[PDB]
Write a protein that binds this ligand. Structure first.
Ligand SMILES: N#Cc1cnc(NC(=O)Nc2cc(Cl)ccc2O[C@@H]2CCNC2)cn1
Length: 265
């Protein structure tokens, strides 16, 4: 079929550009990197999950690398969070379920994202969450042997406290922590602290169990009980994802199905 390989760059998404196929009108996201990127491509070629952004391929045109990635028309989870409010609890629960399915998948194949935040959580046209941007991602398990991490990666409000206080740390609890900060942001519409350090007053209040303060007073006791188990300073005592899957709020029926058309009589 002639022209099937031509894509028009129609708009800047974030550089990330929206590409449309000349013939089929299929939309893809094209990440343009004008020369860490070789690691992003390698990690992307391993990924295949409904809650992880699809990788279609790559092309090197001199100093510029073009990455063909899934287009998610719903945009960023970030823009579904109302400041100081958040979002309805059933929506947050569904996005957290889909976040866990994605993270279970990544950890299962020995990959840690290292930068889970709402900006990197994208939504398709049906509002299905997809983990995106594997630029900071790395291999923490290979040939069934775990590699402890030591590089400081991520975004300060979402990083686990061990990443700031320890020389080495396990990868999986770091991603679990960041998922709990994402859950906080979805239910309160605010970030609890600038960084999880004892010098940060809000972080000290959380360790002092002062849940009568913001953001915790905006959060119902069932999801807050889950946050009490995720945002545990000791990474060895922190809840694991198999046990997040057994939490009472995680399994609480809250969300109705997708609206489906219906008539009467
Ligand atoms: N890395 C990466 C990656 C992979 N796929 C992406 N897909 C999109 O569809 N991007 C997107 C779509 C809308 Cl409607 C709005 C913003 C978007 O990307 C944001 C902007 C910055 N990175 C995430 C975006 N970034």
């Amino acid at each position: 079929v002639p022209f099937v390989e031509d894509w028009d760059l129609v708009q800047t998404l974030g550089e990330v550009q929206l590409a449309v196929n000349r013939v089929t009108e299929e939309a893809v996201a094209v990440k343009i990197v004008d020369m860490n990127i070789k690691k992003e491509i390698c990690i992307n070629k391993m990924l295949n999950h409904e809650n992880v952004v699809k990788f279609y391929g790559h092309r090197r045109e001199g100093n510029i690398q073009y990455l063909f990635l899934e287009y998610c028309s719903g945009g960023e989870l970030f823009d579904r969070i109302e400041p100081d409010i958040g979002m309805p609890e059933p929506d947050a629960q569904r996005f957290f379920h889909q976040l866990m399915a994605g993270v279970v998948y990544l950890h299962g194949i020995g990959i840690t994202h290292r930068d889970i935040k709402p900006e990197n959580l994208l939504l398709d046209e049906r509002d299905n969450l997809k983990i995106s941007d594997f630029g900071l991602a790395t291999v923490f398990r290979y040939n069934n042997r775990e590699r402890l991490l030591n590089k400081m990666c991520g975004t300060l409000p979402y990083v686990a406290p061990e990443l700031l206080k320890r020389r080495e740390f396990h990868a999986e609890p770091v991603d679990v922590w960041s998922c709990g900060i994402v859950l906080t942001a979805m239910l309160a519409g605010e970030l609890p602290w600038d960084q999880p350090s004892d010098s940060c007053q809000e972080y000290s209040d959380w360790k002092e169990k002062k849940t009568y303060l913001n953001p915790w007073k905006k959060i119902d006791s069932a999801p807050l009980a889950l946050l009490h188990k995720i945002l545990v300073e000791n990474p060895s005592a922190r809840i694991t994802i198999p046990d997040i899957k057994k939490d009472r709020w995680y399994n609480k029926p809250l969300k109705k199905g997708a609206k489906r058309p219906r008539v009467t009589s």
